[PDB]
Amino acid sequence: KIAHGATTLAFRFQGGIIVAVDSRATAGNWVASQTVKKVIEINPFLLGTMAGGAADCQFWETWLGSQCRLHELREKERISVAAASRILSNLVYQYKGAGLSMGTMICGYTRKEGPTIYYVDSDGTRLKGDIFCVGSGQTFAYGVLDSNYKWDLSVEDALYLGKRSILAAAHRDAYSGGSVNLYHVTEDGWIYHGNHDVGELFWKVKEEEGSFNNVIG
Amino acid sequence: TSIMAVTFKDGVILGADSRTTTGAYIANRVTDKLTRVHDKIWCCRSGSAADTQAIADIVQYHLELYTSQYGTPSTETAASVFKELCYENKDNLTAGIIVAGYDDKNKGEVYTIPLGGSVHKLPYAIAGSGSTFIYGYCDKNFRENMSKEETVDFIKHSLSQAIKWDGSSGGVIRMVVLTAAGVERLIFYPDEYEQL
Amino acid sequence: TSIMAVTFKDGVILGADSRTTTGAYIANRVTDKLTRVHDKIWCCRSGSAADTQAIADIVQYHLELYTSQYGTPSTETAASVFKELCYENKDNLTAGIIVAGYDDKNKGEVYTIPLGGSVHKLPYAIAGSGSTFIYGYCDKNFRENMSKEETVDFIKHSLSQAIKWDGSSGGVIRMVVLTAAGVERLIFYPDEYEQL
Amino acid sequence: TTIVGVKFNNGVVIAADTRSTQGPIVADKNCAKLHRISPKIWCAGAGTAADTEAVTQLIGSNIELHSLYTSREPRVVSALQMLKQHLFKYQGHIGAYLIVAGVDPTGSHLFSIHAHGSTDVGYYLSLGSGSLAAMAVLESHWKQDLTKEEAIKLASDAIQAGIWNDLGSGSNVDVCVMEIGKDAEYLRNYLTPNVREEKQKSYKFPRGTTAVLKESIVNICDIQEE
Amino acid sequence: SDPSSINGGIVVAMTGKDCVAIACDLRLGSQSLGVSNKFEKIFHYGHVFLGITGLATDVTTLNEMFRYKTNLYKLKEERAIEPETFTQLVSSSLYERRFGPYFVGPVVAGINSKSGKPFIAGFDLIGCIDEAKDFIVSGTASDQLFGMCESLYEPNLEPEDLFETISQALLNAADRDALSGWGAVVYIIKKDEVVKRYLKMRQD
Amino acid sequence: QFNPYGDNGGTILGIAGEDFAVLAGDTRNITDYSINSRYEPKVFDCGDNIVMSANGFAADGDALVKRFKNSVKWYHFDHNDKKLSINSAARNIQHLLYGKRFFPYYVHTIIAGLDEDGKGAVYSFDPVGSYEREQCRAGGAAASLIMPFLDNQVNFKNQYEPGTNGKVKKPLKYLSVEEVIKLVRDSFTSATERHIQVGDGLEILIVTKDGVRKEFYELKRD
Amino acid sequence: TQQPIVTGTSVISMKYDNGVIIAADNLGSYGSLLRFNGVERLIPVGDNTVVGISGDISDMQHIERLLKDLVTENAYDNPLADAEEALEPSYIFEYLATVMYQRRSKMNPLWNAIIVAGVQSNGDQFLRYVNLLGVTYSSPTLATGFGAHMANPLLRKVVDRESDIPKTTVQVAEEAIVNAMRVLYYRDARSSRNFSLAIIDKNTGLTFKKNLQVENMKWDFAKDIKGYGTQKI
Amino acid sequence: MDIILGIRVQDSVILASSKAVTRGISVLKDSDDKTRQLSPHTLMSFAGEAGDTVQFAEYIQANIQLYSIREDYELSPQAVSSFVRQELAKSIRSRRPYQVNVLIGGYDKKKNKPELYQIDYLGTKVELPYGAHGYSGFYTFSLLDHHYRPDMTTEEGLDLLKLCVQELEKRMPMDFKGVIVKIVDKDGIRQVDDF
Amino acid sequence: MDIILGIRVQDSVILASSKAVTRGISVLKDSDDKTRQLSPHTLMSFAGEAGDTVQFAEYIQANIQLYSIREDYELSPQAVSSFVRQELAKSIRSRRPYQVNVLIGGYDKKKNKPELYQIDYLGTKVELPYGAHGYSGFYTFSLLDHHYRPDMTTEEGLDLLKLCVQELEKRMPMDFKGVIVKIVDKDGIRQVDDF
Numbered sequence A: 001k002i003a004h005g006a007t008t009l010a011f012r013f014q015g016g017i018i019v020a021v022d023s024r025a026t027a028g029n030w031v032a033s034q035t036v037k038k039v040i041e042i043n044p045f046l047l048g049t050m051a052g053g054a055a056d057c058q059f060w061e062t063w064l065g066s067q068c069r070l071h072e073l074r075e076k077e078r079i080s081v082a083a084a085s086r087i088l089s090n091l092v093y094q095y096k097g098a099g100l101s102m103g104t105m106i107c108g109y110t111r112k113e114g115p116t117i118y119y120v121d122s123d124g125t126r127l128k129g130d131i132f133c134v135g136s137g138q139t140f141a142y143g144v145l146d147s148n149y150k151w152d153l154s155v156e157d158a159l160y161l162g163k164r165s166i167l168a169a170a171h172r173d174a175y176s177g178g179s180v181n182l183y184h185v186t187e188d189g190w191i192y193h194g195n196h197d198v199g200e201l202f203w204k205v206k207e208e209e210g211s212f213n214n215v216i217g
Numbered sequence B, C: 001t002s003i004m005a006v007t008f009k010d011g012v013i014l015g016a017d018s019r020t021t022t023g024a025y026i027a028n029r030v031t032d033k034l035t036r037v038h039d040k041i042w043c044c045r046s047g048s049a050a051d052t053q054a055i056a057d058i059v060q061y062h063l064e065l066y067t068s069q070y071g072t073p074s075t076e077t078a079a080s081v082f083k084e085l086c087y088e089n090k091d092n093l094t095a096g097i098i099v100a101g102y103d104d105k106n107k108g109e110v111y112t113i114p115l116g117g118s119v120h121k122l123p124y125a126i127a128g129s130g131s132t133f134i135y136g137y138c139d140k141n142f143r144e145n146m147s148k149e150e151t152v153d154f155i156k157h158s159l160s161q162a163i164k165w166d167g168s169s170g171g172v173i174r175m176v177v178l179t180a181a182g183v184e185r186l187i188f189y190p191d192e193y194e195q196l
Numbered sequence D: 001t002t003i004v005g006v007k008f009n010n011g012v013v014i015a016a017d018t019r020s021t022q023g024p025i026v027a028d029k030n031c032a033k034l035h036r037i038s039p040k041i042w043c044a045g046a047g048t049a050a051d052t053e054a055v056t057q058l059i060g061s062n063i064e065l066h067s068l069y070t071s072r073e074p075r076v077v078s079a080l081q082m083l084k085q086h087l088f089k090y091q092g093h094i095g096a097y098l099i100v101a102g103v104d105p106t107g108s109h110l111f112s113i114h115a116h117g118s119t120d121v122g123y124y125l126s127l128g129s130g131s132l133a134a135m136a137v138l139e140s141h142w143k144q145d146l147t148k149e150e151a152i153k154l155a156s157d158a159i160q161a162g163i164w165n166d167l168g169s170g171s172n173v174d175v176c177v178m179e180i181g182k183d184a185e186y187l188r189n190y191l192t193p194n195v196r197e198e199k200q201k202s203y204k205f206p207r208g209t210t211a212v213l214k215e216s217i218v219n220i221c222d223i224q225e226e
Numbered sequence E: 001s002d003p004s005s006i007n008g009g010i011v012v013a014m015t016g017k018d019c020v021a022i023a024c025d026l027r028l029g030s031q032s033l034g035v036s037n038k039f040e041k042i043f044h045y046g047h048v049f050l051g052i053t054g055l056a057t058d059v060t061t062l063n064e065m066f067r068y069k070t071n072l073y074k075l076k077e078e079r080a081i082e083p084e085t086f087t088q089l090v091s092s093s094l095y096e097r098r099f100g101p102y103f104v105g106p107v108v109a110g111i112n113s114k115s116g117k118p119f120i121a122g123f124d125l126i127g128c129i130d131e132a133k134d135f136i137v138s139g140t141a142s143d144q145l146f147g148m149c150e151s152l153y154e155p156n157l158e159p160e161d162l163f164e165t166i167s168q169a170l171l172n173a174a175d176r177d178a179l180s181g182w183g184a185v186v187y188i189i190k191k192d193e194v195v196k197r198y199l200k201m202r203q204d
Numbered sequence F: 001q002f003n004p005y006g007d008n009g010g011t012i013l014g015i016a017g018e019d020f021a022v023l024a025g026d027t028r029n030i031t032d033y034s035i036n037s038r039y040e041p042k043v044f045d046c047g048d049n050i051v052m053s054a055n056g057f058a059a060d061g062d063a064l065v066k067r068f069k070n071s072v073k074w075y076h077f078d079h080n081d082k083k084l085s086i087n088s089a090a091r092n093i094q095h096l097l098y099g100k101r102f103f104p105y106y107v108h109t110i111i112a113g114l115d116e117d118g119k120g121a122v123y124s125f126d127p128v129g130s131y132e133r134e135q136c137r138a139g140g141a142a143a144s145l146i147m148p149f150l151d152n153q154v155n156f157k158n159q160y161e162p163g164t165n166g167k168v169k170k171p172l173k174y175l176s177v178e179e180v181i182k183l184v185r186d187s188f189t190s191a192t193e194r195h196i197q198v199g200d201g202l203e204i205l206i207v208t209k210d211g212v213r214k215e216f217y218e219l220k221r222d
Numbered sequence G: 001t002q003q004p005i006v007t008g009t010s011v012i013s014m015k016y017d018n019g020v021i022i023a024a025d026n027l028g029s030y031g032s033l034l035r036f037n038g039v040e041r042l043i044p045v046g047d048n049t050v051v052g053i054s055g056d057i058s059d060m061q062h063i064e065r066l067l068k069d070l071v072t073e074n075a076y077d078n079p080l081a082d083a084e085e086a087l088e089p090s091y092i093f094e095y096l097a098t099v100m101y102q103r104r105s106k107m108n109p110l111w112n113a114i115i116v117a118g119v120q121s122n123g124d125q126f127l128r129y130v131n132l133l134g135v136t137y138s139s140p141t142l143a144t145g146f147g148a149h150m151a152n153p154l155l156r157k158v159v160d161r162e163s164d165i166p167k168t169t170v171q172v173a174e175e176a177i178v179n180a181m182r183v184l185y186y187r188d189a190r191s192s193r194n195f196s197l198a199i200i201d202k203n204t205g206l207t208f209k210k211n212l213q214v215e216n217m218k219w220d221f222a223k224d225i226k227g228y229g230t231q232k233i
Numbered sequence H, I: 001m002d003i004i005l006g007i008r009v010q011d012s013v014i015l016a017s018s019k020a021v022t023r024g025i026s027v028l029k030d031s032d033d034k035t036r037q038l039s040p041h042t043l044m045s046f047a048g049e050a051g052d053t054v055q056f057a058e059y060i061q062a063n064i065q066l067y068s069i070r071e072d073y074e075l076s077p078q079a080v081s082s083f084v085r086q087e088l089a090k091s092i093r094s095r096r097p098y099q100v101n102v103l104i105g106g107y108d109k110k111k112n113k114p115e116l117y118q119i120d121y122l123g124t125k126v127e128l129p130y131g132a133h134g135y136s137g138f139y140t141f142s143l144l145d146h147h148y149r150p151d152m153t154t155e156e157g158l159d160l161l162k163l164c165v166q167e168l169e170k171r172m173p174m175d176f177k178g179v180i181v182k183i184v185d186k187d188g189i190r191q192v193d194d195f
């Protein structure tokens, strides 16, 4: 019984990248934790998301931060998101078959690239993209994202969209919940936008938005 | 389990250990494996305790009903009723039974019924897990028309060795003597048979 | 296979049947299971024919090299070399070996090495599939400090019974006598030992 | 589960622990494992709880009808025979492991029965996951010609050995004494060596602590007149 | 795969001073997917209350079965069934399906109308009766409930105090179980009045 | 087939106070339905004001603790007797665990102590090395029985202020060392009642700026 | 990975006021066959330690050789080999525990359960267990295999906790051990009547007793037991 | 088969069901109607194992039609749903169970209310404002949770349904070849021929 | 991944490759380019197990680019295809084989001829006028067998390719989200941005 279950997303927009994750960890039906940090702070400019194996994601994305630091010491220049995501994907590819479990979005914003997201997988997949959603509640979050996403979203509205999409998954997916962690990635680094308890957030959103009429409040 | 039945001049004697095991745990160290299906027709039981008890109870019922209608049954008849149950239910049974009895006409007789449900009439029979270790000893030491005292010694010495080597066998050595004189029960304790 | 080694007054005697089987087919009815690893250190082999031959050949090599450097090895030393091979390669070997030898200082000694690769020094040893059927007989009939003729009779009678009951054992009874006088080979045919 | 039976001078005593478990969880702390088959025939049950209950009730019911039919007090051998044949028929799938004891016009009796239908006779017996701990005590302290007081002591000590040393057994000791020419005395919670200590704190909440959405009266009464 | 944890859910019952309480969550799911937040697991036949956890189709079937049987009971007996008698009926009914059982965890709660004595009982899926003095727990968060009840419970609580204890036992147990929650209901039962309260809880 | 793993039962509990931290654990050691020992210490003082417990398979648990204690020793040798901070110990333990990612230490590890600002700190680990700082964490057999109780009585979850009816939460007031020990004792007493692998004794290690103190309490032995 | 072939059953032990007692029978079983009747499973190390071993006998003989080699190695360049720098029970145990855990970690275990009984330099009683998994624990009473299920309950009635150790004499402790060995002979199908017993006392040193037998057995009541229920004759 | 959706609005129930039928490698048909009219104001859609779906639906249809003739009366949606549930609950412990999931959309003429019932092959019944079977809910429920109101019109219900189908067509790997949509209200059952 | 097609006409080679990427339940991307330029006049498309496809393609790309720099010369399509085959033939008996199927479309500047090579993960090479991997050929080869000529123009090749994609979109159960089409001729490699 390793922990399992999650909802994580990341999307590119005019103002950079929004990263949003839930906080729940479950061993079977047993809820092990409601306070899990599913965004790894690789360095002040790069973020990674945790889905699949908790240790695998933690260990190797911290390690990735060490490799990124060594790169900029040697090259006297910020590492690209392309190069960083590639160091991780090449590493896990060496371990293919051994049983690593990883589904992560490597998120960054550089001069040459602009806002960039790479989905990296333990089976060796490396995909560049605009919107990614990974975890047991990924399908629920995709629905809210796809129907409301625009490139010209404001930072305020984009932050809410990411928050609202995790809430949707947290409500319906049994193995997602606890709290929502928000991040906004800019060229000058990521900015943390707080921890939001799903219990309190649900009722707040229900009243203000008029959604979840199926639920009595 | 170590069980045996031996015909001799005056009749037949049944012998058995008293150990019942669940794996390596001895669930009963004073078990009675020598079982009565008629006044002078007894059996030795090996294998499943449940199966051999169920069979013996059914046989006792059949022979009691036989007696009410047709008078005293032969030992061969008792063996046949055992066989019928063991053969027809071979898929679901784990029972190794030795049938032994005393008639006045036929005298002492022994029938062994192994797993398959076959019947074998013999001068003496050995069975159970512990019997393996005394095939050599019993074959070398058995004689026909032994006396009561000689037959008791033969069984005592034989089962003593079977007990010594077989983990599934142990406790006391029970014996039942079947002759014209009647039915005699004998018991022999560890301190007696271990020093042999 | 039925094999045994028995210490007696003048030394030690090894005994064995001559049957090699592939399932129920007798692949060799005149097999020699009594094998020489040194002048007066021999062994009885049971289990895999390939494994026990490979082991015996390696031991013979080791003791030949031991002799060239340090002089004649003890029976204990020979047993230790057997053990080392059987213990360290327990996962890949199926070998049940009895080691028997004669020193002038230590006289007749017997060491049995079962499947696990453990060593057990004993006055006499029995092994192989057929040994199961003579644990009772051998335990009752063995005495220490027997004569040559008595020991030959003990082994002949014992293996005769093992052969009688075990399908995997049969053919001739081979024997090797180890004393100060030298090394004597004996053979006994079915017509002789079956009528015992 | 630890259950035992001990013969004595003028009768027989049985005993049991009171713990029931689902895996590593204790389902019931004060479970009743001593069952009445008839007024003077009682049995202790180990294994599957529903089965020991069900098989005892069924045979107990048929024993009662048999007693009424024959105008005779029921015998232990009848309960034994009916239980074993029922259990044998179901090929061990009815997970009932029983120690059957009692007094009847024939005398005092003590038997064990296993799920597959095999029975055993003895002066002292033990069944269940704690039977090895209990049997260790019985094999150390049992003797012939025990008194009533000595048998109760020995039986309860055997259960205690199971309570303390077997994780499948715990809580309290139940006893039932069946003496010849007397009413059977059922001693529920004969020993209570596992009372929980006082808690450090009281967890009584202030009223209004729990958030409530709706309140309503439930109509448990029938349809009313007028 | 495991029938008792496909749909999820929990039930808890407690005794107090001249009263009993029975409570349950409202979730019904298909493994990870939450399907309904209005699936009540507590039913009543006259003054006897029955909570049922486990496989939802069997929950529904057994409710319909015990409604069937208690209605015939009442017509023939000319009186409502009592908690002690109903407990035996539940046990008998479950055991008749010994080798093809309903995958459920029933819980009986009520007050005997004649003696006025509070009563609770629990069962396994095949009929075994657990008649506890203090409390009964059932469902996918039974371990959590055992932990809550064993610490929070004290004997002889007044109805309004008992409400707080059982509510907190359920809520906090449910919040540590993925397959439980999505609302909750608490029944407070006295000899001739029964109050039903829906609780406000986190909806994830 | 040979199974290199086993289950020795046991339950552990770490709570972080305002200026203190406790790490508690029962003293019972088991296999299947037997008791190996009624008093087998499970929580250890590892030096540098850090306490540790690795619950689950005891052989792996002892190995890990032994290797961490060793790591503290070599940290002093290599870095001029510098004090190993709790956060640095936590990261080091991750690498010890993940080093056997493909043949894991079969244990739930918890460490407790004080952070570099003097505030109480508890860290929790999974078998393969994922970790997280926490205010409250139970581990092992009876973890499922204890955590929901702690959510309610430490973090005041589902508790609201009377009169408001769900509108105002109960305020998160700080707990003293005496108050925490009461909750620990009641957690284990309740676990003992309903879990067969929990009992015999309760050993608590309390960490403050003054050092590491020990307290022992009896538990039911059935 | 292997399977045990020739095996030894229970080892039992307990602490008393001035030392420790340990015991084990002299059987080497080959499955259900009680093959070897003269196997010594208590192996003394020096005059202050006795290692009792159960499980695979071939692995026991290997461990026996390791301990013999350990004594030799300790004596090398050690003028205080028979004094201050002699082998302690704690040293011998930790060594074995290290080997057991290392061997399980290579998926090639020594298929044994071991109890190390002894007395330390300062007079303290030493009693600790280790097995094929490298699992270790200590207790006032320790037993392996069937002994864990049947001997411990009896020995724990004498010494239930730490405070009972000073109140327990060597006579009472030995009596309890001997009784436990009798109970194991009644109930363990892979046991023998013959056993060895060892006492390690801080005053009187190491007393090693060979060729002991289970005596004072109750079997007479067997004569009254007839049939399996209804049978009277 | 694959995707079946249901939504209960103010005055009607709307059922949407995919048109594709796939025999492993090939799509054999792209116009399959996965529904049966049980009574004039009751419609049942279905999805599950091949053969069982149609066989079950038609068996239910026959039984309800028999009841209608015998009593000269239409059963309520609640009554029909309970009958269907019992048949599935009976089926799950049979020798070979019906591997069929259904939605029952009906308009109760007595209460003047639309009603939607979701029943899976185990006999698990729930009354819902909107429902689905299989993986359909995983994509659509988040949209329905956001946009749904009990006072929605039929036209608003269809628009919300279009948004659900669009999300399925974007994120589902299987091509289900669109959906047939049917409306159940006071006037009976009709099909939306353009969707 | 899923569908990759190839056709060799008079003066060019055309490769068509699906855009979808599916992680089990969801379609994560609908614009994925399943190809790598090995040299100015050689293109390789690929499909197989996740990760292995891109890792293999990029490894091959690097090796051919290395050769180009070292010799200041472009290898012939035949030479590149033989190198790729050997790598896959080496891979199939490795500890963990590359689970990758490829098409290699190249224009030989020496012979002035287009060339299409089909190679599966075992290292099975064939030169073909048209080719495919997976289930793609099962639907398309019957159309190509009927319509194909060696003297077809590039425009006629694209039209025949459209007919193949239309048949796939009709009869395949999976939604592969259309195809990216690329042309390889004497002037090099270019992408058809509208298809």
Ligand SMILES: *[B]([O])([O])[C]([C][C]([C])[C])[N]C(=O)[C]([C]C1=[C][C]=[C][C]=[C]1)[N]C(=O)C1=[C]N=[C][C]=N1
Binding pocket: B001, B002, B019, B020, B021, B022, B027, B031, B033, B045, B046, B047, B048, B049, B050, B052, B128, B129, B168, B169, D114, D118
């Ligand atoms: B004997 O070993 O065959 C013995 C004879 C039986 C009539 C008492 N059988 C058993 O002890 C069997 C196990 C067994 C051992 C060896 C061979 C075949 C079978 N035991 C049981 O049947 C048993 C054990 N515990 C409870 C109930 N029954």
Ligand SMILES: *[B]([O])([O])[C]([C][C]([C])[C])[N]C(=O)[C]([C]C1=[C][C]=[C][C]=[C]1)[N]C(=O)C1=[C]N=[C][C]=N1
Binding pocket: C001, C002, C019, C020, C021, C022, C027, C031, C033, C045, C046, C047, C048, C049, C050, C052, C128, C129, C168, C169
């Ligand atoms: B004896 O039966 O153990 C015998 C001794 C061998 C050294 C000559 N072994 C065999 O005959 C074995 C099989 C076997 C039989 C019974 C027990 C264990 C093993 N046979 C072979 O090794 C064999 C047979 N045919 C060809 C080659 N090898």
Ligand SMILES: *[B]([O])([O])[C]([C][C]([C])[C])[N]C(=O)[C]([C]C1=[C][C]=[C][C]=[C]1)[N]C(=O)C1=[C]N=[C][C]=N1
Binding pocket: D001, D002, D019, D020, D021, D022, D023, D027, D031, D033, D045, D046, D047, D048, D049, D050, D052, D128, D129, D168, D169, E123, E124, E128
């Ligand atoms: B005892 O441990 O044998 C005990 C005696 C029983 C008759 C009251 N048995 C149990 O507690 C059994 C253990 C068991 C668990 C699982 C399958 C079979 C047996 N428990 C129960 O029967 C049980 C468990 N949970 C609820 C109700 N009953």
Ligand SMILES: [Cl-]
Binding pocket: B031, B032, B033, B049, B053, D119, G228
């Ligand atoms: Cl029997």
Ligand SMILES: [Cl-]
Binding pocket: C031, C032, C033, C049, C053
């Ligand atoms: Cl040979």
Ligand SMILES: [Mg+2]
Binding pocket: A169, A170, A171, A172, A173, A174, A175, A176, A177, E203, E204
């Ligand atoms: Mg959730």
Ligand SMILES: [Mg+2]
Binding pocket: A170, A171, A172, A173, A174, A175, E034, E203, E204
């Ligand atoms: Mg949920």
Ligand SMILES: [Mg+2]
Binding pocket: B048, B051, B092, B093, B094
């Ligand atoms: Mg049977």
Ligand SMILES: [Mg+2]
Binding pocket: B163, B164, B165, B166, B167, B168, B169, B170
């Ligand atoms: Mg024996």
Ligand SMILES: [Mg+2]
Binding pocket: E174, E175, E176, E177, E178, E179, E180, E181, E182, E204
């Ligand atoms: Mg929950």
Ligand SMILES: [Mg+2]
Binding pocket: F191, F192, F193, F194, F195, F196, F197, F198, F199, F220, F222
């Ligand atoms: Mg406990």
Ligand SMILES: [Mg+2]
Binding pocket: E035, H118, H119, H120, H124, H125, H126
């Ligand atoms: Mg459903």
